[PDB]
């Protein structure tokens, strides 16, 4: 399952998307 993260996804995730929430943009990372 994905995760909302700053300021990248890891190894072995891509991005899909953005979360938008306290304050920030995350990377959306599956
Ligand atoms: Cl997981
Ligand atoms: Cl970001």
């Known amino acids: ?3 909302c993260r700053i ?3 890891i190894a072995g995730e ?3 998307a953005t ?3 306290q304050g ?3 990377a959306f990372c599956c």
């Open 7 to 9: 300021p990248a996804c």
């Open 24 to 26: 920030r943009l995350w």
């Open 19 to 21: 979360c938008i929430y």
């Open 1 to 3: 399952a994905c995760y």
């Open 14 to 16: 891509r991005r899909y």
